[model samples]
Target: SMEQLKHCNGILKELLSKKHAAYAWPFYKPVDASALGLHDYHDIIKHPMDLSTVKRKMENRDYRDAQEFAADVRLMFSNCYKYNPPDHDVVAMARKLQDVFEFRYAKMPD
Candidate 1:
């Protein structure tokens, strides 16, 4: 329903606006050298990709509606594309997901 969509959008807006929010990204934090009990090495900790803050935000909630859920889905795909534009598989996956949303929304009544 349109009303449900609107309500979802409102909730999503509120959720995403908060500080320390999480979103999807393809990255991982490297293990801390110190945590491995090696303190002599002064190397800076590095990660192939870091979306810790977004990850934290995402951990804070389970989406309450379609629009809210869709926002994260779209964001995850968008970030994948943004970070790896040349990957055919990622692009295909994103397109497929987009189609799913389109079909789902289309079936809804106005």
Candidate 2:
């Protein structure tokens, strides 16, 4: 299963590479409630997820499999949707990234 972990983590790294998009910056790291002045964020998003955190977990080998990693990615997007209005640009970015991930995810080797 080590190879599975390695391959799955690689997939996440590839997805995270899309952070070149300005809108993707928000999801790249954990939200700083104090700095952003959205103090209610932690209260609303019980389990926040982000790109760097995902990669940190990868570095720590915290995942059991690809599905576990994917679920966190899903959680990150879900948190974005939960926090932002549907019309917000961040919401659109999350939707776009989630769409691309889903499309490429299906093609992963068995």
Candidate 3:
């Protein structure tokens, strides 16, 4: 199972690079997908799409850049609620998504 372990390690590395390791693993501890009913470690990440470009633009005070970002965030949680995953607490997810939007709005320089 060394190969499987290696693959999981690579997933951790990628997740850590994107700061999602905290959400997925929550403490940098080793993870086993099979134990969690996942086919692979990568399944822990809900969305693989990159939103850093949106983050970067928002940081630069690009309000127009937020349209797509906000839409995507909205759509993601919408789908999350639709699926009703056991861990999918819609309220908490909505709050977190709102936090992302708030962070973007806060960057506006008056």
Candidate 4:
């Protein structure tokens, strides 16, 4: 089974190297979760918590809220750029959106 899985992984590597979009999937093999030794699972179990916190912070007009939210949004966009560039147009779209708002409401109290 290990040999078969390794063979499949090799094929996947070759396919991806050629920029092929799809390839055969190797059969799943279970592993002990503890063996991974991940200390934090916040990103997995509580992803929405991050977004919700940022949204609430913004809605309440918390001072420095925009800066904090912008940092999170930028981090999200940067990560997207690594994995999926074309699908992450929001990175550029956000800049344009901010420009539009700033142009319309210049000198409006923050």
Candidate 5:
């Protein structure tokens, strides 16, 4: 339903400020492999995504639908998962914040 798209800003803003927002801090800035000393990051993840990227896209009104926005969010964590081990705390935090996004996203009214 377009209902979700209509409220994209609402859900995102809520996630940005609510209690669990801190979990998203590490994910706000774009990942830089050269500084982080990561190898094959760009090749492995293909397209890196972060909260700041999403903010830019949304502010630009480049997002066409809620699913597109959700895909980018998921892509951010997906990129994280490929870089870090499953047991890594970074991965844990990504999934934790992902759960919050998913929960509220699905709850959006049609």
Candidate 6:
């Protein structure tokens, strides 16, 4: 059980890091500024992935597949979204991250 949790945590950490990097795009310039009603907008602040926090949270949780992993990640994203609304491109990148994980790891019917 711990092994599975650790494995999933590792996968989630990797995905989060990738998503953090991908969230840095130019779309946040005018689009995000206008959306947030700001006269000037630069790149949004990128938070570092807290793997320890995530690992601790996952310590008692269970995940059987990529779908579960994606759910966990989405929950994590939702936490971040609470502080500041994510840019449109950021949201798109997050969704794409989940889809890629599901595509790579989900059990598909032949």
Identify the leading candidate in terms of lDDT.
Answer: 5
Count clashes in each candidate, considering only residues at least 3 apart in sequence or on different chains: 4, 0, 0, 0, 0, 0
Across 1-110, the per-residue lDDT of candidate 2 in tens digits comes to 78777777767776778553655677777988899999899899999889999989899989888889889989999998888888898898788778867876777777
lDDT of each: 0.45, 0.82, 0.42, 0.36, 0.83, 0.48
Name the runs in model 6 displaced over 4 angstroms. Answer: 18-20, 24-53, 59-70, 77-87, 104-110
Give lDDT: candidate 2, residue 46.
97
Predicted candidate 5 versus true structure: per-residue lDDT over 1-110, tens digit per residue: 45666688877776677577668877878998899898888888888999888888888888888889999988998889888888888888898888888888888776
- lDDT by residue (1-110, candidate 1, tens digit) is 44665544443344334331332112223324468574632332221222343344445644455565556545555655654447566476556545644565555545
The residue-by-residue lDDT of candidate 4 on 1-110, one tens digit each, is 33333333343233224232222111111212366563443334332222334344444645252344445534433433333346555445434433432343332234
Q: What TM value does model 5 have?
A: 0.88
Query: Could you tell me every candidate's TM-score relative to the true structure?
Result: 0.39, 0.88, 0.32, 0.28, 0.88, 0.39
Whole-structure CA lDDT of model 5 = 0.83
Per-residue lDDT of 9-67 in model 3, one digit per residue for the tens?
Answer: 34324433544433432222322356856574355455433234334434464434434
Query: Between 5 and 6, whose TM-score is larger?
Result: 5
TM-score pick, better of 1 and 2 = 2
Against the correct fold, how does model 2 do in TM-score?
Answer: 0.88
Please give the lDDT score at residue 102 for candidate 3. Answer: 50
Q: Write model 6 residue lDDT over 20-59, tens digit each, in one string.
A: 4565332212234467674533334333233344455566
Error of 4 at 107 (Å): 8.3
RMSD of 2: 1.7
User: Model 4 off-target regions past 4 Å?
Assistant: 1-53, 60-65, 85-110
**Deviation of model 5 at 87, angstroms:** 1.1
